Design a protein around this ligand. Structure first.
Ligand SMILES: CC[C@]1(O)Cc2c(O)c3c(c(O)c2[C@@H](O[C@H]2C[C@H](N)[C@H](O)[C@H](C)O2)C1)C(=O)c1c(OC)cccc1C3=O
Ligand SMILES: CC[C@]1(O)Cc2c(O)c3c(c(O)c2[C@@H](O[C@H]2C[C@H](N)[C@H](O)[C@H](C)O2)C1)C(=O)c1c(OC)cccc1C3=O
Ligand SMILES: Nc1ncnc2c1ncn2[C@@H]1O[C@H](CSCC[C@H](N)C(=O)O)[C@@H](O)[C@H]1O
Ligand SMILES: Nc1ncnc2c1ncn2[C@@H]1O[C@H](CSCC[C@H](N)C(=O)O)[C@@H](O)[C@H]1O
Lengths: 330, 339
């Protein structure tokens, strides 16, 4: 029988089971403490309570002092590229969603998401009704592609981007390859952002917005179909529905590109972020992060065979991902 | 100038809200205990009545962070902390059916706490902490059990550190289910004892003293320590009570104990009371301080702060000694006061 050491207990108490310190980091972010300090009178907070928070933040290595952030505390500076202050801000969509993890017990007992239980509407319904949440989710997901540079667009003519958000990805591709036509299928919230983006980029004559629902048949065919960070939002059954719609819209010899986190044994990818994202998808909306082999197996159920595979990743966060290219089997 | 390791620390540790909830779900489901009695994944799911694919995704996260390995699926060395018999009792403290981890979930309201100075517990659970315990019996039971666990010998600290040969009557004010008082009584067979507590702990203490052979000299009085105390005594004990309360409420309790003190009596205060010299881990000072604030509006006080508060109630410090948990990294102080 293994015997925990004092260091194991330390790790459990200060790190793995510590719920207080992540909330203290979020409250600090939401208070812009690091920023508002690079500027009693401190925030709209109760001063003795704020001092008690800062004592904690000092001990865990965020602040020090002449009260100053540490080298680590400079991650909550609004200027830092990794944008952790916005990620942690309690008014933003991700931190707001993170609080639903206090319902993790029912999630694990049932596999059903917790988001609506804390807040009333499902995730996407909530983003559509709450402009503030939608705006912040937009800014976290769209700061700083991949397919525009990874893929040979000279042999493509029409790209259909299924659930392509505010059209950022489709715009990068279309600016890159002036000969391309494009269609974006999205819900009304993101459909309008993308409409405005395409008109601003001088793309409206060849890149169109087809507002709709990717659980219905797609309105057009194309020789490249893009699914960028869509499948991980959905259960296996829903994800198979989406993929079959995509297959139906593929033209002869067309290709389907799935951009997603798709782990391979022995790639360099940090499995912590794999599981963190996987539990977020489970808890926020009942999705699931799938490995390379699981995506390939699900795509095979939809009549697709893997043609090629490429990797990319974030330029401000420690997160690598893949682009998987599929062809129709017959 | 943040390094790459800095960002790793923020994402995996300091800002990570997911892993601590996974630990609490793991403890609640007793996963490690099920693994230690015999494993497969689907068997684990049936013994825990959980969704099989969701449990597998929880276990994969637990594997990555070092609580589980295998899958044969088994606890790591660190994961053995979640075995129900481990002396530090972290499975029970993390159990979402127990009072402490239940209250921890109110930390989602920490923003309001820093804005207003008021606790978050009622904002989540409808009524404040002590109110909720008196109305929810299973919650109240789990809390008393967490406080009274005898794996940690901290409860023997007064019995071992103090000289009881001349003491005639000890009054333990808020003494839980009586563990501390029983320890003193067993070391000083001449002594008489009185315990004042809420209805739940008071009956658990009545049972303790009966089973121990102590009922003839240690009596229990269900009471409110915001109301005059029912007996006087030459030693009064206040063990980890004051930190649950605001300065105004703590002072009312202290004044109540003063009036209970017989002439030349001693008040013993056990609490966490940091001193700038000492080497006690300020992580646990601040963590417990934010829990008292968030759960009930309490405050962890330094030694100077306790001594100042006691001086307002008419008490001067006679002596001070360090003690500590024998299972957790948690030193504390025994502060002796005289009128
Ligand atoms: C695992 C740690 C992570 O850094 C944080 C994170 C994250 O918290 C979420 C999502 C993520 O993709 C990620 C990843 O971070 C990056 C990856 C993206 N490719 C993109 O580069 C952007 C910068 O976010 C990983 C989502 O994709 C997401 C979502 O998809 C529509 C819906 C709701 C919540 C999240 C959600 O909370
Ligand atoms: C930080 C490490 C620690 O284990 C954590 C801890 C703690 O988290 C809490 C409480 C603690 O007392 C403690 C400390 O435990 C001490 C106090 C007792 N004499 C007890 O018998 C034990 C042997 O040592 C220390 C409470 O006492 C408490 C409470 O008291 C009424 C009400 C709500 C939450 C806590 C609460 O969360
Ligand atoms: N039934 C549905 N039909 C079409 N789009 C949907 C949808 N349900 C969710 N979505 C869209 O799915 C998207 C997932 S996230 C946006 C990912 C985007 N392609 C990118 O890489 O940046 C959201 O924009 C959401 O509006
Ligand atoms: N109004 C009140 N009157 C009497 N006891 C109270 C009380 N409010 C809270 N308490 C008791 O205060 C105690 C604080 S925690 C238990 C501390 C105990 N002396 C020990 O060292 O183990 C709890 O047992 C709780 O029941």
């Amino acid at each position: 029988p293994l015997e925990p050491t004092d260091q194991d207990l330390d790790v459990l108490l200060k790190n793995l089971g510590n719920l207080v310190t992540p909330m203290a980091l979020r409250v600090a972010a939401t208070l812009r403490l690091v920023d508002h300090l690079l500027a009693a009178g401190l925030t709209d907070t109760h001063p003795q309570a704020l001092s008690r928070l800062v004592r904690h933040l000092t001990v865990v290595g965020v602040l020090e002092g002449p009260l100053r952030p540490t080298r680590l505390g400079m991650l909550l500076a609004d200027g830092h590229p990794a944008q952790q202050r916005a990620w942690l801000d309690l008014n933003g969509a991700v931190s707001h969603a993170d609080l639903a993890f206090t319902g993790l017990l029912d999630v694990v007992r049932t596999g059903r998401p917790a988001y609506a239980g804390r807040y009333g509407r499902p995730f996407w319904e909530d983003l559509s009704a709450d402009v503030a949440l939608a705006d912040s989710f937009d800014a976290l997901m769209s700061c700083d592609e991949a397919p525009a540079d990874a893929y040979d667009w000279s042999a493509v003519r029409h790209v259909l981007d299924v659930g392509g958000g505010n059209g950022g990805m489709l715009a990068a591709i279309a600016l890159r390859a002036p000969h391309l036509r494009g269609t974006l299928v999205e819900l009304a919230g993101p459909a309008e952002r993308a409409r405005r983006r395409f008109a601003d980029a001088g793309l409206a004559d060849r890149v169109t917005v087809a507002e709709g629902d990717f659980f219905k048949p797609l309105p057009v065919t194309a020789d490249v179909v893009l699914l960028s960070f869509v499948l991980l939002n959905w259960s296996d059954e829903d994800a198979l529905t989406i993929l079959r719609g995509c297959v139906r819209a593929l033209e002869p010899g067309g290709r389907l590109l799935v951009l997603d986190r798709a782990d391979v044994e022995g790639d360099g990818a940090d499995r912590f972020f794999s599981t963190l994202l996987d539990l977020r998808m489970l808890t926020f909306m009942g999705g699931r992060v799938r490995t390379r082999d699981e995506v390939v197996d699900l795509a095979g159920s939809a009549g697709l065979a893997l043609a090629s595979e490429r990797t990319s990743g974030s330029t401000t966060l420690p997160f690598d991902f893949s682009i998987l290219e599929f062809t129709a089997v017959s």
